[PDB]
Design a protein around this nucleic acid. Structure first.
Ligand SMILES: [K+]
Ligand SMILES: [Mg+2]
Ligand SMILES: [Mg+2]
Ligand SMILES: [Mg+2]
Ligand SMILES: [Mg+2]
Lengths: 58, 183, 350, 137, 40, 161, 48, 133, 182, 49
RNA sequence: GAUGGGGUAGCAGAACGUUGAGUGAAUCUUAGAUUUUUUUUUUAUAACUAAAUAUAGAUGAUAACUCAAGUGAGAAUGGU
């Protein structure tokens, strides 16, 4: 199992679990391209006031 | 580090071992056949085995700095075994730094004043590390001339049977069998 | 001033609020880091993780405070730990079962769990501080979480005149850990033994809330995994929570109850008798079987030590290191439940 | 009669059950006027944006510090702090130092003495003279 | 030191010593050692 | 020695003899009972519930007793009527009918006499003072050696000794 | 954008607002040297 | 895969049933006696590992309990046990200076050494059930 | 909580190796016991140390307000029949403090000051050597008996915190090996 | 002397010394809180600049 | 999965530090510049973090690059 890693030459390489096997390296010039959760992603999660766990799960 | 995490109490305790200078020793004897020719352990071969006990080097936790030694009670030192003509031809020398004052004495003349226990203390003393623990270790060697000594109650026992006694081995195997009745 | 503009844009009526606003939690780097540090799922927003840091002493309002998140969380921790402790050690006495519960989910360990997450506390609660800091008022002791335990009528006489309490009653009247229920401002002062306890209580409430917030957002299973990972993963030597009074008498009562023949102390090995540091190895035998072994320097101490080890072995019997818990059934289909061993209670003797 | 002791608490083992990165904050102080901060300014523009995205559990705080060398000061969970001066270093050297602060712990440096460190008892108890087959001198 | 002539400052501290020891006056902390705003 | 590596070799201790007989051409399991004191988590078979299937013959089986030290005997020589006389005498003259006199008269243990009867409060306080006056004649060397004997007994019962 | 000073850190922790009251209560300067002037005892003696 | 010995198939359940278990793992050939929860401080900087990576150790010479010990000829079969670790970052030592010098020669050459060490944490050490094998 | 006075004497016409022995004689003693030992000493500097020890006590009482509770303390001892306090100094000397305000010499050391003068020693072969006439000062730290009653209680508590002597101590095995030797 | 007098007041608190009743300083011979005539009248000659 | 690794006389290369100078009428400093200390971290003859003490707005300090040397001392029965 590997964790999210930034490679200087290539870019950010997401976490991979070789037990269930995927080295995806996303490079770009914007936060969204890297594949990480940005401030905008955190504001859409805070506006989802209707989502709720199912009663059986709870 | 797990192997040494635990109770070290009994690993550092002082055990009171016992050995007779007259009982034949199949291991420390140079004559290994026939059964009737097996001799006791010689002076230097008994002393080398005792120096190992006084240093605690027989333990798996031995450390030269820590004094993890044990006690050794040596009896029947009057019949201390020796080969050749050592008893009457070996000389012990002593000097006090003053020229002229060299004191010499044979092994037999040294056994008439302080018995055979002194001849054994000199052998074990020279086999111990020359440092600040040499006198503590050598003090745990309690050598006596006959079979009488004040440590007949200190000698390590297993089930009431003193080690080296007729039936001490069987008493030890009986206690370990009950130890296996557990998870 | 003109040379030093404020680092954080805040309205003028922000230093008077009890705690920062909810929308303030969406611009702090401490929360976003504390959220990713605990690997919390994206279902839990930053506005909820910001509400777990506002103690009930910094904000009196029922909302905006940790009081109701900490309660629901305390129930999950105290429950999942108890069922796991009984399934692991089904013979523990009731007294030690409270100290083991307090050793895992008590305020002291929770304080170390809160500090292991990199949670810094705020000096004084206020709206200006960033929501990423645990904010509480240690000076105010008028904060107490609702507990299922009831108040004892003799509590006044209990502390003053040293009245007896008893163990069987602590299960109903006392709290989960057996404790008794209900046991301007100038900052020119020093720490106090009460503030030290109030600060510890604040850290404990935060950790409980994180489990309560996970339950509401992520459900039951997510909360159990969190408790199992951060709280149950800790190591505790339960053998060191044992204090015995007249152990030899207790062992005789145990053997008498279980019908075992009377215990007999036997000298397995001894050395250095008549010395400064002797060693006596004694083993207590019930007939042929060997119950416990004890090695001490005194003949009496060796017999007492051996009796304690015989009792520790009885109370510390464990069916398995990772035994099944009854809570594994209510979740998705699992193997049929197997009855767990139920002890008949600790031995009471003279 | 068994009485419970109420002065012993459980000890946490980071890495067992859950893992928590010790480095909880990283201060990045630069200077717009100092010549030694030339590389740090490049690291903040080309390598920090991605290094900060790969470590979402670290609080990065970039603030200026004129008339002073640039430093990387990481704060750890145990309360201690490690500061590294990166004066006259190239951007990629700043990233090799920032990786040292992330992989490191607040603990002070110590000489290598023993590989393994354990708090649990021995599976096979410590050696005891009396619990064996006996030894004959 | 034993031969130095006692000045007026040493003759005043010997009278205060006899007043404090006897019990006439009661000692109190100084109030002019420094002019602090805290006044504590 | 000069370096740490040289010190490690001079202080070397080989592993146990059993770990030196490594197998060849396969894996095996060997019975290696260590010469050490077992913990309290190795529950004896007598303390295991009947349901527990882990109960099994000794591992050895899958491949007289030592001297007595303390074997007490309980005796009940005091009848209910004799317990009322003990309470009368003790409360009548606590100085003459001490727990030792009554222990010998009724062939009982000194503890039992105290279980069924207690001396008057005045007499008890007189006993605590007698021992208190004896504890003030001790020097600093004997008063500290007696305090250690009281702490070693409390540490023993806490599992610290 | 600017240098973080000890004062800014106190504001973040919340301690600053408590310091303003104590200093103002004791008539001490908050972010200043006050209306007191520089040492002039040596200046009046002709010190250079 | 070679079948496990029948003698190992009858005593492994007795070995896994006991309370505690230890193992001697081999990293790059060097042994390390560890238990679940131990913190191994390797005397080298493992290349290509960040704090949080999970390793799977597969070279174990000895897996034993108090009374029972499982010894593989070269190594124990990977199917019998399961051991895993987690990288807890890297640590360093205080810079130690070695002064190389000879008698009657003023020159003192300095050697500065500061090595890094990877720290692991044994988070799983379990013996598998081999009834199927 | 504890009063203290550090008094530096004047410039005495002597050396450190001579006055060092007079500052070690009054160390630990009470101001009264020290003044009785300086009045009957054969040293010429004992008369200067006696006047400089009376000035220190005059400042300790007027400025620091030390030793001003003898009348109040004497009451509890006799009026109420109280048991005085028994302590032991760091050296081991036992004392019975009936007045906790009694002044004593906590610390004392000697420093060397400027050179008094320079005398010329004219030896043989037309050789001259400068002889430096020395000048030294002494510093005494006067405290009350509350400092000694507190320092003693701390030492007693530090001895009751190291635990008792156990017969079989659990000494650590400070050597790691990747195997079991038993 | 005021840098050390202000630290004792802050620290000693109720035990602050009554310095006004202390002896003069042999360095200059001035009492506590008192100047010298040369410094109180500013009679010390100054340079032409 | 590059090769190489002791060193005197001696030869060679690459750097740090010290004093002064240019950019400099520049940059920063009671929101603490500077403080012979202590402490912390970093492959480290050096700098850095923090703490403590004191109180400066320039007759203060200073990055970077460059220029010039009264530039680096356990060793001269050396000098003061
Ligand atoms: K400084
Ligand atoms: Mg002449
Ligand atoms: Mg070579
Ligand atoms: Mg010279
Ligand atoms: Mg000279």
């Amino acid at each position: 199992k590997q964790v999210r890693r930034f490679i200087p030459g290539v870019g950010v390489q997401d976490e991979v679990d070789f037990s269930k096997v995927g080295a995806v390296v996303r490079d770009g010039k914007r936060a969204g391209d890297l594949g990480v959760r940005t401030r905008s992603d955190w504001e859409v999660i805070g506006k989802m006031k209707s989502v709720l766990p199912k009663v059986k799960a709870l | 580090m797990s192997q040494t995490v635990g109770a070290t109490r009994l690993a550092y305790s002082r055990v009171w071992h016992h050995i007779s200078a007259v009982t034949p020793h199949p291991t420390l004897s140079t004559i290994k056949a026939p059964s009737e020719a097996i001799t006791p352990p010689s002076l230097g071969r008994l002393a080398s085995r005792i120096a190992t006990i006084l240093m605690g080097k027989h333990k798996p936790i031995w450390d030269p700095s820590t004094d993890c030694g044990d006690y050794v009670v040596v009896t029947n030192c009057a019949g201390l075994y020796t080969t050749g003509h050592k008893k009457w031809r070996k000389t012990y020398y002593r000097h006090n730094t003053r020229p002229g004052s060299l004191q010499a004495i044979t092994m037999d003349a040294l056994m008439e004043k302080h018995g055979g226990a002194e001849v054994l203390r000199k052998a074990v003393s020279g086999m111990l590390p020359k440092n600040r623990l040499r006198d503590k270790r050598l003090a745990r060697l309690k050598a006596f001339e006959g079979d009488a000594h004040p440590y007949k109650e200190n000698l390590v026992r297993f089930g009431g049977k003193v080690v080296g006694a007729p039936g001490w081995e069987e008493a030890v195997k009986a206690i370990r069998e009950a130890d296996m009745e557990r998870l | 001033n003109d040379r030093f503009p404020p680092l954080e844009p805040l309205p003028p009526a922000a230093e008077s609020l009890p705690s920062p606003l909810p929308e303030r939690a969406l611009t702090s780097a401490k929360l976003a880091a504390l959220h990713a540090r605990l690997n919390l799922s994206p279902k839990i927003p930053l506005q909820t993780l910001a509400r777990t840091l506002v103690d009930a002493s910094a904000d009196e309002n029922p909302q905006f405070n940790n009081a109701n998140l900490a309660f629901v969380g305390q129930t999950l921790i105290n429950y999942h730990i108890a069922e796991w402790l009984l399934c692991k050690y089904p013979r523990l006495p009731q007294g030690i079962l409270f100290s083991a519960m307090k050793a895992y989910a008590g305020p002291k360990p929770l304080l170390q769990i809160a500090r292991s997450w990199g949670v810094d506390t705020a000096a004084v609660p206020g709206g200006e501080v960033d929501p990423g800091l645990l904010q509480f008022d240690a000076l105010k002791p008028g904060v107490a979480i609702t507990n299922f335990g009831y108040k004892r009528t003799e509590l006044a006489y209990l502390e003053k005149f040293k009245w007896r309490r008893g163990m069987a009653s602590r299960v109903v009247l006392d709290d989960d850990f057996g404790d008794v229920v209900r046991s301007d401002v100038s900052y020119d002062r020093y720490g106090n033994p009460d503030t030290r306890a109030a600060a510890e209580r604040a850290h404990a409430y935060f950790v409980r809330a994180v489990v309560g917030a996970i339950y509401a957002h992520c459900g039951r299973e997510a909360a159990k995994a969190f408790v199992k990972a951060h709280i149950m993963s800790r190591t505790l030597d339960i053998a060191k929570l044992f204090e015995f009074k007249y152990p030899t008498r207790e062992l005789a009562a145990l053997c008498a109850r279980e019908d075992f023949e009377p215990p007999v102390a036997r000298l397995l090995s001894e050395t250095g008798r008549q010395s400064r540091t002797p060693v006596f190895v004694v083993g207590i035998y019930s007939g042929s079987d060997k119950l416990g072994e004890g090695a001490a320097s005194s003949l009496d101490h060796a017999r007492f030590k051996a009796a304690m080890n015989a009792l520790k072995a009885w109370y510390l019997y464990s069916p398995g290191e990772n035994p099944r818990v009854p809570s594994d059934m209510l979740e998705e289909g699992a193997k049929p439940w197997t009855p767990a061993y139920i002890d008949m209670g600790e031995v009471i003797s003279r | 009669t068994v009485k419970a002791l109420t002065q012993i608490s459980s000890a946490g083992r980071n890495g067992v059950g859950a893992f928590v990165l010790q480095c909880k904050k990283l201060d990045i102080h630069y200077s717009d006027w100092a010549g030694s901060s030339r590389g740090m300014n490049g690291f903040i523009k080309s390598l920090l944006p991605k290094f900060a995205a790969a470590n979402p559990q670290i609080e990065f705080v970039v603030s200026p510090r004129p008339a002073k060398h640039p430093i990387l000061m990481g704060h750890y969970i145990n309360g201690r702090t490690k500061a590294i001066c990166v004066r006259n270093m190239e951007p990629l050297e700043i990233l090799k130092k920032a990786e040292l602060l992330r992989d490191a712990s607040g603990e002070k440096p110590q000489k290598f003495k023993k590989p393994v460190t354990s708090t649990n008892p021995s599976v096979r108890g410590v050696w005891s003279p009396y619990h064996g087959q006996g030894m004959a001198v | 030191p034993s031969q130095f002539e006692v000045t007026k400052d040493r003759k005043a501290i010997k009278a205060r010593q006899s007043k404090f020891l006897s019990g006439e006056e009661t000692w109190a902390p100084g109030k002019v050692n420094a002019f602090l705003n805290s006044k504590i | 020695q000069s370096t740490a590596n040289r010190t490690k070799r001079m202080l070397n201790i080989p592993p146990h003899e059993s770990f030196l007989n490594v197998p060849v051409e396969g894996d095996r399991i060997i019975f290696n009972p260590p010469s050490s004191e077992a913990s309290v988590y190795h529950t004896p078979f007598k303390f295991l519930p009947r349901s527990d299937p882990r109960r099994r013959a000794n591992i050895y089986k899958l491949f007289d007793l030592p001297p007595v030290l303390y074997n007490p005997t309980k005796s009940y020589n005091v009848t209910p009527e004799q317990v009322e006389e003990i309470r009368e005498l003790r409360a009548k003259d606590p100085k003459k009918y001490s727990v030792t006199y009554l222990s010998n008269k009724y062939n009982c243990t000194k503890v039992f006499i105290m279980m069924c009867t207690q001396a008057p409060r005045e007499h008890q306080e007189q006993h605590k003072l007698a021992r208190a006056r004896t504890a003030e004649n001790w020097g600093p060397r004997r008063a500290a050696a007696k305090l250690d004997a009281r702490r070693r007994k409390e540490m023993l019962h806490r599992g610290e000794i | 954008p600017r240098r973080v000073t000890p004062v800014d850190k106190e504001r973040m922790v919340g301690r600053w607002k408590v310091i303003q009251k104590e200093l103002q209560k004791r008539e001490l300067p908050v972010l200043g040297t006050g209306n007191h002037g520089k040492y002039v005892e040596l200046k009046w003696l002709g010190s250079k | 895969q070679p079948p496990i010995s029948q003698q190992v198939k009858e005593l492994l359940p007795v070995l896994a049933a006991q309370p505690g278990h230890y193992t001697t793992i081999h990293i790059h050939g060097k042994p390390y006696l560890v238990t679940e929860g131990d913190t191994v401080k390797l005397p080298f900087k493992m290349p290509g590992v960040a704090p949080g990576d999970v390793l799977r150790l597969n070279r174990a010479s000895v897996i034993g309990s108090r009374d029972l010990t499982l010894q593989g000829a070269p190594y124990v079969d990977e199917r019998l046990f399961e051991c895993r670790a987690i990288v807890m970052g890297t640590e360093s030592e205080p810079m130690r200076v070695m002064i190389k010098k000879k008698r009657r020669c003023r020159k003192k050459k300095h050697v500065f050494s500061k090595h890094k060490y990877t720290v692991l944490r044994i988070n799983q050490l379990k013996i598998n059930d081999v009834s199927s094998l | 909580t504890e009063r203290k006075l550090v008094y530096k004497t004047g410039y005495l016409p002597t050396s450190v190796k001579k006055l060092v022995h007079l500052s070690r004689q009054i160390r630990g003693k009470t101001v009264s016991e020290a003044l009785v030992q300086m009045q009957f000493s054969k040293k010429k500097m004992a008369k200067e140390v006696k006047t400089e020890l009376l000035r220190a006590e005059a400042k300790a009482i007027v400025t620091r307000g030390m030793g001003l509770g003898k009348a109040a303390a004497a009451a509890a001892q006799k009026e109420t029949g109280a048991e005085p306090v028994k302590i032991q100094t760091k050296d081991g000397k036992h004392l019975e403090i009936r007045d906790p305000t009694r002044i004593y010499v906590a610390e004392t050391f000697v420093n060397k000051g400027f050179t008094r003068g320079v005398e010329l020693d004219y030896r043989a072969r037309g050789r001259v050597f400068k002889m430096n006439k020395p000048t030294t000062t002494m510093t005494v730290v006067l405290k009350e008996e509350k400092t000694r009653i507190r320092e003693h209680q701390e030492r007693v508590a530090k001895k009751l915190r190291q635990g008792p002597w156990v017969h079989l101590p659990d000494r650590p095995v400070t050597s790691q090996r990747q195997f079991y030797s038993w | 002397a005021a840098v050390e007098a202000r630290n004792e007041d802050w620290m000693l608190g109720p035990l602050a010394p009554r310095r006004e009743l202390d002896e003069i300083t042999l360095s200059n011979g001035n009492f506590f809180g008192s100047l010298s005539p040369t410094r109180a009248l500013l009679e010390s000659e100054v340079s032409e600049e």
